[PDB]
Amino acid sequence: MLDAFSRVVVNSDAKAAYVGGSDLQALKSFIADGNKRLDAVNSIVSNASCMVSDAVSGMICENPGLISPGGNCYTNRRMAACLRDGEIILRYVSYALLAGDASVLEDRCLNGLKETYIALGVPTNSSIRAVSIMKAQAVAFITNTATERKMSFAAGDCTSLASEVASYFDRVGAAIS
Amino acid sequence: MQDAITSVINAADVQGKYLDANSVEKLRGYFQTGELRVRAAATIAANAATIIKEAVAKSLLYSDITRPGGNMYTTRRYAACIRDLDYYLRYATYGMLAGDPSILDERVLNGLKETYNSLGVPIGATIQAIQAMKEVTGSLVGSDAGKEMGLYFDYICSGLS
Amino acid sequence: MQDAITSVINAADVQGKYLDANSVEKLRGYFQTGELRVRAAATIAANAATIIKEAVAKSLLYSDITRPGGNMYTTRRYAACIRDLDYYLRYATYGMLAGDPSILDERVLNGLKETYNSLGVPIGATIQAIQAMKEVTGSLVGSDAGKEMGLYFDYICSGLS
Amino acid sequence: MQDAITSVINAADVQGKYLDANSVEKLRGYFQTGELRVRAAATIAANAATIIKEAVAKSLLYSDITRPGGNMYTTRRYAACIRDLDYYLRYATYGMLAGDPSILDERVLNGLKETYNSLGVPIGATIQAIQAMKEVTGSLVGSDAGKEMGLYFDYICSGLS
Amino acid sequence: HPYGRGNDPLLIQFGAIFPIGTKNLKQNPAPFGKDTRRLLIRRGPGIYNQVGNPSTRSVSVGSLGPKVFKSEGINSNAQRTNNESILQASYLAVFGRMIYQNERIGLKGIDNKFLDNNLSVKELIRSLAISDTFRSLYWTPLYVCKSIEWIHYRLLGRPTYGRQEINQYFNVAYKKGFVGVINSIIDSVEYNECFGDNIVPYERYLTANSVSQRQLKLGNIIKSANLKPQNIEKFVQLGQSQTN
Amino acid sequence: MQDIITSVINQYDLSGRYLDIKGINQINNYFDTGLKRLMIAKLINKEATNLIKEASELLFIEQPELLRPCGNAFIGNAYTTRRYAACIRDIEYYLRYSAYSIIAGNNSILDERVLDGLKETYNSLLVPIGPTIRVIQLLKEIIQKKFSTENIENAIIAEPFDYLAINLSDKNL
Amino acid sequence: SIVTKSIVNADAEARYLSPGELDRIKSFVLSGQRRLRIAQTLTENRERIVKQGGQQLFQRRPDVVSPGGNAYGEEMTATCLRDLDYYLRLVTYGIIAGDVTPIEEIGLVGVKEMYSALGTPISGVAEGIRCMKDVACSLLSGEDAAEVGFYFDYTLAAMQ
Amino acid sequence: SIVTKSIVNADAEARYLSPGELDRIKSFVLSGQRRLRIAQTLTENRERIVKQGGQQLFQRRPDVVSPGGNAYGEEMTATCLRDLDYYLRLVTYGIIAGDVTPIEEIGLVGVKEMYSALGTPISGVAEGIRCMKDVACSLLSGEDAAEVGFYFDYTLAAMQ
Amino acid sequence: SIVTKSIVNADAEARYLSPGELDRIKSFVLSGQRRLRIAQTLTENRERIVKQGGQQLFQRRPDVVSPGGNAYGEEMTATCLRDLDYYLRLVTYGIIAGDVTPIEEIGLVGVKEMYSALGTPISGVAEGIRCMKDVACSLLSGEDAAEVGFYFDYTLAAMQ
Ligand SMILES: C=CC1=C(C)[C@@H](Cc2[nH]c(/C=C3N=C(/C=C4\NC(=O)[C@H](C)[C@H]4CC)C(C)=C\3CCC(=O)O)c(CCC(=O)O)c2C)NC1=O
Ligand SMILES: C=CC1=C(C)[C@@H](Cc2[nH]c(/C=C3N=C(/C=C4\NC(=O)[C@H](C)[C@H]4CC)C(C)=C\3CCC(=O)O)c(CCC(=O)O)c2C)NC1=O
Ligand SMILES: C=CC1=C(C)[C@@H](Cc2[nH]c(/C=C3N=C(/C=C4\NC(=O)[C@H](C)[C@H]4CC)C(C)=C\3CCC(=O)O)c(CCC(=O)O)c2C)NC1=O
Ligand SMILES: CCC1=C(C)/C(=C/C2=NC(=C\c3[nH]c(/C=C4\NC(=O)[C@H](C)[C@H]4CC)c(C)c3CCC(=O)O)/C(CCC(=O)O)=C2C)NC1=O
Ligand SMILES: CCC1=C(C)/C(=C/C2=NC(=C\c3[nH]c(/C=C4\NC(=O)[C@H](C)[C@H]4CC)c(C)c3CCC(=O)O)/C(CCC(=O)O)=C2C)NC1=O
Ligand SMILES: CCC1=C(C)/C(=C/C2=NC(=C\c3[nH]c(/C=C4\NC(=O)[C@H](C)[C@H]4CC)c(C)c3CCC(=O)O)/C(CCC(=O)O)=C2C)NC1=O
Ligand SMILES: CCC1=C(C)/C(=C/C2=NC(=C\c3[nH]c(/C=C4\NC(=O)[C@H](C)[C@H]4CC)c(C)c3CCC(=O)O)/C(CCC(=O)O)=C2C)NC1=O
Ligand SMILES: CCC1=C(C)/C(=C/C2=NC(=C\c3[nH]c(/C=C4\NC(=O)[C@H](C)[C@H]4CC)c(C)c3CCC(=O)O)/C(CCC(=O)O)=C2C)NC1=O
């Protein structure tokens, strides 16, 4: 795994050079904007349990055939596996948001997830939608858009970190598609 | 002070012009309403004390400003404020007869807000008393003369606010 | 702001003088009452909310100003006025600790009458609420501290009237 | 700012009253004319530049105020005055949609005469340009909407005079 | 104002109007001590006044104050859809109006970089305020302490409190100049607690003359309807019959 | 102006209430010192010329620059006979008005007839304000040397001069 | 009012009302008639609403009327019912305005400060408002009750 | 009174007051001024003290005001608050006397017999006195509250 | 003054003085007597303090009184001793106030600007103040000298 600091190095070491001012002010701001990122991730850990229930029940609320007899989220054993998988995906997206890089999301989570689904018979269409509801919840929690719960913070703009998690979520979506 | 006629003559004279059709338009307009203006001024001169009494009774007579701590608590202050209201009514009548509020600017509004602020006189209560006086005056003189008088009453209230 | 010590030092310094026997007299006078002042300030800090509640209940709680049309009718206005009373109590406590009302002149009374007049806040009711607060405060702190606090309460009321 | 609905609700709320038959009368009156108001506002938004151009052409375009030594002689001053006329038209449209001139008091007329007097802007020429704009606007929107718009145009002219 | 009465500007949309002066002769000096604080009136509910609730910075007034413009970017993909429009709002915060076209071509470099999501709102407000257009309008034509009072009102939504706050900024102009004053205001703690890097500055506090001017007006002060509660006559109730 | 009785009565009229025991105690406080206040007034009227001569001498002994040329700074000090006479006249002014204030038990006569506008006049004439207060408290000490052990008369004398000194001063602190 | 709020939000940006805001004003003036009807029904059934809400409150919160409670005694109970009537009137105002501006500007800004200064538990007021909400929604149709409880819910949220 | 008790205790032994007793009388007359101040504060805040003590009692002992309890009804509750006022007055007397002689000679000797004859539970009176003690000590300073609760504690001990 | 500074720091937060601030005011008014005694001793030994400090300064910094130095000549040396007397007086003010507010508001704010405009080396003034500090602390006890040099050290730090 890598983070945001390591990815410029994997590049700086490939050019057999040091780390001057050129490729640093981007990293200089990252460290300076470290407070907003820690303010950002905490809002997802605070509401992680409600996010999967609002996501997976909304998946069935838009698709009642998953619980028709024979469906993927039909029985009591399969519902637990799907509610487990949703929270695993949310956990890795929170890892990638805290890291500032999607390296930990690729190899430990998305590398071998497509093959496991196709072989299991998990409907990608319904699985792909399950991530986008969580994306809509995350961008509301990061920019304090949650209409049911509000949190306390210092005022300002947080789209940067919010856009970083929106790009992570459909990166998850593109790998399992 | 300049009335409607003086203002028209000044606008024409400040350009070296003779009184053309627009000046005649304004002059005829003033001459047609002059008789109504005289009627209203006479009626207002007739009932000034009752107008002030009724406006004070409907606006600030039983409020807290007349109680201890209020501006017009003592007898000096009560008399001073009723004299002020008499001033406002008389000058509004002058302005209505003249058809021009310049007398209000020269003789009333010049340095009035500053005097009231130095004395501590509440401006909002004064504006409300003038508004109540506008009601009674329009009531007594009828609709057209009441609109004419209310023009200058609102002029005083805007200059005071 | 200047307390009693600052005022004595200023009076001595503005003449190029050393602190002579009269300055020592005033300084001893302040130093003897300082401990009573600290006791009173602590007790007042303890019971500020109850003092304001009881003063409001005895002065203007059931009058017509709290009904529709009154100043403090809506919840915004009620909260604003209780905040004002809290300001008055806190600054009177500061003045009592300092032994000098200059903080009241600099931080409270400067432009207060004009603000209240522009807003339409009744001054008499405010002075009466401050007088009721003076009763409760003297009650709670005892006779000597109550006279000390009432000095600055009356100072605020005189600066407001 | 408060529109007709806000004003009715405020008049009812300041007395602890529920909305009775007279409030319903005023509310129905506003609701019946709302659609005409929206039509007029759309049409005025469509043709603001042409309205200002035609008013300026008929009121002060060839007078002496535009010659070397005039108020609006240089290009800075010409642009500034056409921007002022755009302000007046936009705020009159807001007032017509709201059915209440309080926005004109809060956002336009507050301290406007004093600014114009400090700058040296002629008030009479401004009032005449606003009157010419009233003609074109009533012309473009028809009789009823023109009377509605002329109400607030005359309100601005009275607040400026 | 702690200085003469002529040091108070008119609080209008776009201003720089000081009516007291050579032509008016309505001038009132008054002895104001060094320690002194002006009673400001909050643009909104009283109780969010910040003098007895210093914690109420960052907290919305609601419908009783001016509108607040924020570049939130909260869409399910976190896109900003008001870049065109937060930029228009900043021009009014800094200038009060839209500057002329020939004036604005010197500021296109600043505007293009903001519309590409490369500037915060705070850095945009800084770039407009330190420009040659703002300086030629509000620094050079004005008395040095009248200019500080006006600029302090545009960037922070309030006039100054007293002499301690004004000899303070006045000393920065003595040593650094026009740019030293604009930077020390924007980098203040009051700026970053009220606006952050995200919000366009809005009007926060007023004066007694400003409020007395806005309110106290016909069309704003009710024509005595709080009093005058009309009720039925008792002799009319005693002769009334059934409703329907 | 207002004496102490008038100001107490005005404080009670402001709230529209009758006099209670607190204000009556305040009035009794004045009624019990009135006679010694009159004794002080008579002493001041008996010794005015000598008191002011002593005060002026003690002022000019420690501020000798007040008697020398103004320096180019056109300062109004006691340089020539004209300025000297004017300054002694002012000293008599201060003595008279603080005698009034001692008799009234109040300082309102002071700030209405002495303090209002004083600093404007002295600034326009460039009269020294430091030595001016210095001579006032010199006068206070000279008067207090007549009644020393009677402490109540000491405070009664200290009131007006100390009010004048604290109000003519600038607030360095 | 919806018109007022649209006008201010457009005024801050120095622009005319866009076609979306005008669309919404149009939809509001078109629904004003059923708004007035609903305000009628809630307005003229005030006695039963206040009475039955006071009952449900006093059965759910017996401490406030227990011996010594804030609303203990005839006068205090009358004052509490007076407060409930205040809030019902504000809800009717908000229903006719189309937005919670009347409710929030009158009765919500600084309500916690007032009720803390009076010694009244704010949760009791919230309970009374909820009881009045149930009683009032019982007298309306499905869609009407849904739209009317929309304001009771806001008043409850602001009064937490 | 401390002076009285010293005089009797010296009188039984047929001797003048020793220098210790005179020392203590001296210390008492020197502290009389703050004693009067504390009695002032407790005396003129009697309404809040009785009210808030009655609340804490009725919340701690709901049976006495429950249906049928000794203080059940308007009149009985008023009488119980009257008793609490009696005991607050006695505590002020004891504070100014410097000793519990006023409290004990009036209101403590034979209190169990009286309250048993009336049918009142003495533990309820003790609870009311404790609640009044907390309320009254809340309004005093540290040392003042310590010295004032000194008498409430004695009244509670005698009323077990 | 300590009381003044506590009052302002409590005023900005819109709260009464907490018990810590009142504790500290109490401790200050209790120590005021030895504060006045120390101010006495420093005040009435001013001639020796200024003289001996001027000596130690002129022996440590012969350039300032050398031919042409800032304090060169009879008048300039007298003016420098005048400045040292100014600062000793300010130190006595600060000792009685219990805090460096008098010293800092008079004589420290803008001192560098003044002495740069006059052409005087500020380090020479610092040396003079240090010499006066040693001379003055020589006349006090251990704890008194420690507390008195507490202000000379602040004046030196501000005058770097
Ligand atoms: C490290 C990353 C990591 C993951 C992502 C998951 C991936 C994953 N999911 C399942 C297994 C499963 N996953 C699902 C899920 C679903 N069916 C649907 O239509 C919905 C889209 C979705 C719920 C939201 C179901 C229903 C099963 C069980 C299949 C069955 O028994 O019918 C399995 C097989 C193991 C098992 O049976 O539990 C694995 C490896 N596990 C991991 O370790
Ligand atoms: C039966 C049908 C049925 C549905 C259609 C859904 C309803 C639903 N809610 C959300 C949307 C959401 N769901 C949440 C989740 C929460 N909100 C909180 O504040 C809590 C902390 C947490 C659950 C307790 C959030 C934060 C949003 C974003 C919008 C919002 O702020 O409410 C979305 C995503 C929108 C999209 O698809 O883009 C959906 C489909 N749930 C259902 O059951
Ligand atoms: C583990 C504990 C821990 C945290 C959670 C964060 C907590 C935190 N966040 C911020 C501070 C902040 N936090 C935000 C973030 C936001 N503001 C908003 O309006 C949005 C809701 C959200 C966007 C994601 C902003 C905009 C600031 C102030 C600007 C900044 O810090 O750069 C600050 C102030 C210090 C600073 O200025 O940097 C702190 C302590 N830091 C910690 O040590
Ligand atoms: C929203 C309400 C509102 C208004 C109306 C307003 C007006 C306003 N008009 C101004 C100037 C001006 N206004 C005019 C207007 C006119 N000249 C004429 O001859 C005509 C009669 C008239 C146009 C009809 C001119 C020429 C100036 C420029 C003055 C100058 O450059 O000296 C200025 C000075 C600001 C600047 O341009 O730098 C303000 C603030 N401000 C406001 O907030
Ligand atoms: C530190 C000194 C100081 C004071 C005292 C002060 C007062 C002050 N009081 C205000 C309002 C107010 N003040 C009151 C007070 C009262 N109403 C009554 O009926 C009573 C008589 C009185 C309370 C005793 C009310 C009701 C308002 C609100 C006015 C309104 O909302 O229109 C406002 C307007 C600010 C706002 O609330 O948005 C200020 C600035 N400011 C200061 O700096
Ligand atoms: C660019 C034109 C301009 C000028 C001139 C100006 C003057 C100005 N002089 C000030 C103070 C002052 N000015 C002086 C000046 C003097 N004392 C004397 O005895 C001398 C006669 C005189 C010097 C020759 C002093 C002593 C103060 C400080 C007042 C105080 O601290 O109370 C202040 C108060 C600001 C502060 O220091 O905090 C201003 C704004 N401002 C301007 O914008
Ligand atoms: C140029 C016109 C002019 C003169 C002359 C003048 C004199 C003058 N002489 C004074 C005092 C004095 N003058 C003298 C002495 C004398 N004086 C003499 O002309 C004699 C030579 C001598 C007596 C033999 C003494 C001893 C004092 C001290 C005052 C005292 O304590 O009585 C004083 C009071 C202040 C001071 O002590 O310096 C003035 C103002 N003022 C003027 O404007
Ligand atoms: C329009 C918005 C608005 C509100 C809400 C308002 C409330 C308000 N409630 C009051 C009292 C009160 N309110 C209550 C209410 C309650 N007791 C309880 O236990 C319950 C929880 C609650 C009833 C649901 C009581 C008991 C009092 C009297 C308190 C006292 O006098 O001790 C008072 C003081 C007396 C009076 O009614 O004039 C005001 C001003 N004023 C307003 O302008």
Short mmCIF file of C-alpha atoms in Angstrom, two decimals, chain B residues 113 133 140:
data_model
loop_
_atom_site.label_atom_id
_atom_site.label_comp_id
_atom_site.label_asym_id
_atom_site.label_seq_id
_atom_site.Cartn_x
_atom_site.Cartn_y
_atom_site.Cartn_z
CA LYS B 113 -32.60 65.41 13.72
CA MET B 133 -51.95 63.75 12.88
CA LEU B 140 -61.22 66.52 8.56
#
